[PDB]
Amino acid sequence: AAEYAVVLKTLSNPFWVDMKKGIEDEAKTLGVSVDIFASPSEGDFQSQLQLFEDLSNKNYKGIAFAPLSSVNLVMPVARAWKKGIYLVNLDEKIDMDNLKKAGGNVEAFVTTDNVAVGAKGASFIIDKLGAEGGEVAIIEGKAGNASGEARRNGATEAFKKASQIKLVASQPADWDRIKALDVATNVLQRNPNIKAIYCANDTMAMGVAQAVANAGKTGKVLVVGTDGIPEARKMVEAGQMTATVAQNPADIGATGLKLMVDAEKSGKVIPLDKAPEFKLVDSILVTQ
Domains of the chain in sequence order: 1-110+250-278 (3.40.50.2300), 111-249+279-288 (3.40.50.2300)
H and E: helices and strands count for the chain: 10, 12
How far apart, in whole angstroms, are the C-alpha atoms of residue 267 and residue 256? 17
Q: Is the dihedral of CA 198, 280, 64, 73 positive or negative?
A: negative
Query: What are the residues whose beta carbons fall under 8 Å from the beta carbon of 151, sequence distance 6 or more?
Result: 114, 115, 117, 118, 121, 141, 200, 226
Question: Resolution in A, one decimal?
Answer: 3.1
How far apart, in whole angstroms, are the C-alpha atoms of residue 229 and residue 180? 16
Strands 243-246 and 284-287, by their bridges, are antiparallel
How far apart, in whole angstroms, are the C-alpha atoms of residue 27 and residue 125? 38
Residue of 103, 107, 99, 85 whose CA lies nearest to 274: 107
Strands 243-246 and 222-227, by their bridges, are parallel
Opening angle at CA 92, ends 87 and 93, nearest 5: 65
Question: 61: helix, coil or strand?
Answer: coil
- Rounded to 10 deg, the angle between the 114-129 and 146-161 helix axes is 30
How far apart, in whole angstroms, are the C-alpha atoms of residue 143 and residue 5? 36
Residue of 145, 216, 139 whose CA lies nearest to 177: 139
Strands, DSSP E only, in the chain?
4-8, 34-38, 62-65, 86-90, 108-111, 134-139, 165-171, 194-199, 222-227, 243-246, 277-280, 284-287
- Is-contact 277 108, C-beta < 8 A? yes
How far apart, in whole angstroms, are the C-alpha atoms of residue 173 and residue 24? 38
How far apart, in whole angstroms, are the C-alpha atoms of residue 269 and residue 161? 43
Q: Counting every residue, how long is the chain? A: 288
How far apart, in whole angstroms, are the C-alpha atoms of residue 280 and residue 255? 9
Residue type, 172: P
Give, for 261, the enclosing helix (H) or strand (E). Answer: helix 249-266
Residue type, 19: M
What technique was this entry resolved by? X-ray
Give, for 122, the enclosing helix (H) or strand (E). Answer: helix 114-129
